Design a binder for this molecule. Structure first.
Ligand SMILES: Cc1cc2nc3c(=O)[nH]c(=O)nc-3n(C[C@H](O)[C@H](O)[C@H](O)COP(=O)(O)OP(=O)(O)OC[C@H]3O[C@@H](n4cnc5c(N)ncnc54)[C@H](O)[C@@H]3O)c2cc1C
Lengths: 110, 133, 666
């Protein structure tokens, strides 16, 4: 303190996950299970509508509807697999109607 | 609070110098002996490398061959094809070596030679025999 | 700042916070709402501002209320209680000022003050202004104590006190506005000349000062971080820590040398393995050169499968020659490295005797600011008061600092030539036994109610004590006396008849040849009217220089001046005065210093008064009788003149703390 000439300089010191996380975790959740994804009653009414345009006054066995749902969902899951491959091939991540149309074009479904 | 620029200060060195009355003298003498030890190791290795440099007097100048500068041809003759087969047998996938052995075939033509004559010359069997050695 | 906050900064008080002292006196305000606290802070700082504006008259308390916040009548006589509280404890109306209201013709209480120093004179006039009887007992034939000024004709020189450390917040600024003090600024330009007399270049001086500041930064982190405070069951000083660090930098230079040679043996061994591969490859190339010549002696189309065998040995030889050419490229790269880094090793950077001489001067300057060698300062608390420094430049007293204590002694009852022998303090009063310095047989006896002791701490530590206390002080008090120390520095006055230095330079330094004599005549001063130089002696040599006659010291001062400016340019001085504060029996050293093993708590223990035991067995707790003051009784501002000034104001403020109103009666 008595330093008057050249003093001593020293001696002084809600949560929201990012987009894509829940989606991937949901993908893992549905790839592990095999339960049907489309609900049974709206699907059964839709098929009844389609059949009325083919032949009138028709009855369906419950097993017939379940078999229709099994083949339909398997076809759609496989189609989205091909659809996702097309979208990734176009340097994209998002599926678009052009991807499904391209997939069905390669399959020969016209 | 933090050691200065280019300056290391640890508690071990402070305690070592103040270990007893003649600790600093002991440390300085040991560092001087280490400095003398590394210096004579410099002198011995310097003498060894000087002798090794004396053995390399002349280089490989009398052991150099002139370059056979010749253009790359386009047709494959029977001699050139057999020389390529034997080159694959000894070298394998070294395209530059095979090109130099044949002499008139560039690297790209040797790489193309592998594809065009793959089945007709059994190159896969020749390559798998090279890998065995 | 300015206004109310600027007045709090000038009086060492936080502008937006109440101190612990303000909390103990008014516990109702600090424990109440925050708005009442802000009103108390505003009333305090406004009266502080009114005092700092006009310190030459009494700042009254009726005009303060009249000139504050229009007609301000929303308080039940609250300004009276606050103004009387602040004026007593020396926060407002500090120093010695002309009082408007006359002093009471009948005084209350008798107080004897030992020593007429700055602390003894401040508390005395404060005691007298409060309405008490005061009598000062001084052993010297003058006042000021450790404030000495040599006056002879036109020569003025201060042997103890003259420079201050700034006016920002310092009560010395008001003292200068009160007492006629001509203040002159100090030019910090201090050139350095070696023992031969030649100056130090700018590049060298800046690098030694930078390394000196680097060693002080090492001091800071060794203290506050590494806690290097216990060594061999003893407190650690500072000269040991710095010398160890310096020896470690020489170790760092040796390690940089060893590591530099380690990198050379590393690359040299890589060249060893590289040359060995070149030799072995040269022998293989020499063998292949001998082989294919025999294959060339036969026509190529003569034998079969020669084009394969010839080109195979030719391609392998070409590949090995290409590698030898690249290894020869690396050989050339390693040779140019053995020609570039051979004569330029990053080494040979110690401190040497060149920088050590200047470093010894900086150490002597640091020893001068503490009046003790670096081997006696406590590493932990040697700069404990470094956070309370004052702002502004450093100034001096152009006409001798003794104009302050002589002016403060105006109107007091001081007994000059009166040395105190014993100090008796009991539960009903005090008795001071004193003698005359002209004849020790003549004894004087003074009765009083309280005694204020301003004696230096070095006197009490010496056995036998020069001043006896009856009853003796307790062990905890005497231990704090013995743990602390008392420094030493001296000054040598050189009065010449003509200017023979640089008038524009107020001070220049002289480095020492050795380390033991670093504090021997290291700095002279120029800042008075007459051509006078003030030599400085400190360190362990200071005590030895006192045993040397005056002629030898002046002869050394002249020999240094003749070695710097020349023999003919240096005339002979007219008057020479050498100070010996350690030999002074009324000081026993210079001024306080934090010793190894002590702390700031010891300064507070010196501030605490002692209370004698009851005279009758069964009597209640008596009133504290004996109080102390001086520079060694204040913790925040030790070893200064305003610190002793504040100690006298402190004991003046502790009067009401001892009285504590008239509530204990009823
Ligand atoms: C050499 C030196 C130079 C300084 N220079 C400066 C400076 O330039 N600037 C600055 O701001 N500060 C400076 N200071 C600091 C300042 O001068 C002191 O720190 C401060 O004034 C000490 O005052 P004090 O009253 O406590 O001591 P003192 O005033 O010394 O108290 C004791 C006094 O009583 C007397 N006395 C002694 N024994 C007895 C006794 N038995 N009976 C009666 N009286 C007795 C003494 O002679 C002395 O006058 C300096 C200090 C010293 C030692």
């Amino acid at each position: 303190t008595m330093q008057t000439a050249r003093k001593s300089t020293g001696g002084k010191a809600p949560h929201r996950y990012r987009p894509g996380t829940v989606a991937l975790r949901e993908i893992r959740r549905y790839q592990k299970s095999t339960e049907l994804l489309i609900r049974k009653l709206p699907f059964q009414r839709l098929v009844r509508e389609i059949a009325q345009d083919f032949k009138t006054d028709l009855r369906f066995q419950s097993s017939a509807v379940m078999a229709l749902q099994e083949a339909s969902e398997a076809y759609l899951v496989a189609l989205f697999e091909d659809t996702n491959l097309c979208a990734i091939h176009a340097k994209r991540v998002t599926i678009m109607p052009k991807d499904i149309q391209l997939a069905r074009r390669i399959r020969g479904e016209r | 609070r933090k050691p200065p620029k280019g300056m290391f200060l640890s508690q071990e060195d402070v305690e070592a110098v103040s270990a007893n009355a003649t600790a600093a003298t002991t440390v300085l003498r040991q560092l001087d002996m280490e400095l003398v030890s590394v210096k004579r190791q410099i002198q011995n290795i310097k003498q060894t490398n000087s002798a090794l440099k004396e053995k390399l007097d002349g280089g490989i100048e009398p052991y150099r061959l002139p370059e056979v500068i010749q253009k790359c041809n386009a047709r494959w003759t029977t001699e050139e094809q057999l020389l390529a087969v034997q080159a694959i047998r000894k070298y394998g996938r070294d395209f530059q070596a095979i090109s130099d052995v044949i002499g008139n075939k560039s690297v790209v033509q040797v790489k193309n030679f592998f594809v065009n004559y793959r089945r007709r010359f059994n190159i896969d069997e020749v390559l798998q025999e090279w890998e065995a050695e | 700042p300015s206004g109310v906050e600027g007045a709090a900064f000038q009086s060492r008080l936080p502008h937006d916070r109440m101190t612990s002292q303000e909390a103990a006196c008014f516990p109702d305000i600090i424990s109440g709402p925050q708005q009442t606290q802000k009103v108390f802070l505003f009333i305090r700082n406004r009266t502080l501002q009114l005092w700092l504006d006009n310190p030459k008259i009494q700042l009254t308390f009726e005009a303060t209320l009249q000139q504050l916040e229009a007609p301000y009548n929303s308080d039940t006589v609250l300004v009276h209680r606050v103004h009387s509280y602040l004026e007593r404890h020396g926060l407002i109306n500090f120093g010695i000022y002309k009082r408007i209201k006359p002093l009471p013709t009948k005084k209350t209480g008798k107080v004897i003050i030992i020593g007429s120093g700055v602390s003894g004179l401040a508390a005395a006039r404060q005691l007298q202004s409060f309405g008490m009887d005061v009598t000062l007992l001084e052993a010297r034939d003058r006042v000021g104590g450790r404030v000495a000024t040599f006056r002879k004709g036109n020569y003025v020189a201060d042997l103890g006190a003259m420079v201050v450390t700034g006016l920002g917040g310092n009560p010395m600024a008001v003292v200068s506005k009160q007492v006629n003090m001509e203040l002159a600024k100090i030019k910090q330009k201090c050139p350095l000349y070696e023992a031969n007399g030649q100056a130090v270049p700018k590049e060298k001086d800046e690098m030694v000062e930078q390394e000196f500041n680097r060693l002080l930064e090492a001091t800071s982190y060794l203290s506050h971080q590494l806690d290097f405070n216990v060594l061999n069951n003893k407190p650690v000083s500072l000269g040991q820590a710095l010398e160890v660090v310096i020896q470690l930098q020489e170790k760092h230079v040796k390690d940089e040398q060893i590591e530099h040679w380690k990198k050379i043996v590393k690359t040299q061994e890589e060249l060893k393995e590289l040359l060995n591969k070149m030799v072995n490859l040269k022998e293989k190339i020499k063998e292949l050169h001998q082989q294919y010549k025999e294959a060339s002696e036969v026509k190529p189309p003569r034998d079969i499968t020669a084009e394969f065998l010839v080109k195979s040995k030719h391609r392998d030889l070409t590949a090995l020659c290409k590698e030898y050419d690249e290894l020869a490229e690396t050989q050339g790269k390693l040779e140019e490295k053995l020609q570039e880094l051979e004569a330029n090793p990053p080494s040979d950077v110690y401190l040497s005797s060149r920088d050590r001489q200047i470093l010894d001067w900086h150490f002597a300057n640091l020893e001068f600011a503490n009046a003790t060698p670096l081997s006696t300062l406590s590493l932990k608390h040697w700069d404990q008061d470094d956070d309370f420094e004052f702002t502004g430049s450093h100034l001096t007293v152009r006409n001798g600092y003794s104009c302050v204590p002589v002016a403060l002694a105006e109107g007091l009852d001081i007994k000059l030539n009166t040395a105190v022998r014993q100090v008796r303090y009991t539960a009903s009063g005090c008795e001071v036994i004193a003698v005359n310095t002209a004849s020790t047989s003549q004894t004087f006896i003074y009765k009083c109610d309280a005694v204020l002791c301003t004696l230096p701490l070095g006197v009490l530590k010496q056995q036998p004590p020069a001043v006896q206390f009856v009853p003796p002080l307790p062990e905890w008090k005497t231990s704090a006396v013995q743990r602390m120390g008392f420094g030493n520095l001296n000054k040598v006055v050189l009065c010449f008849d003509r200017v023979f230095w640089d008038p524009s330079v107020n001070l220049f330094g002289h480095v020492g040849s050795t380390t033991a004599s670093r504090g021997e005549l290291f700095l002279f001063w120029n800042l008075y009217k007459a051509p006078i130089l003030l030599a400085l002696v400190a360190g362990e040599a200071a005590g030895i220089m006192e045993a040397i006659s005056d002629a030898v010291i002046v002869g050394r001062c002249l020999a240094i001046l003749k070695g710097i400016f020349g023999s003919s340019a240096v005339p002979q001085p007219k008057e020479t005065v050498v100070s010996r504060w350690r030999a002074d029996p009324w000081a026993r050293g210079s001024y306080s210093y934090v010793a190894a093993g002590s702390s700031g708590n010891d300064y507070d223990l010196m501030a605490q008064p002692i209370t004698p035991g009851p005279s009758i067995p069964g009597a209640p707790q008596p009133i504290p009788r004996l109080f102390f003051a001086g520079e060694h009784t204040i913790r925040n501002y030790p070893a200064t003149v305003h610190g002793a000034l504040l100690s006298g104001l402190r004991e003046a403020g502790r009067i009401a703390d001892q009285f504590l109103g008239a509530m204990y009666t009823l």
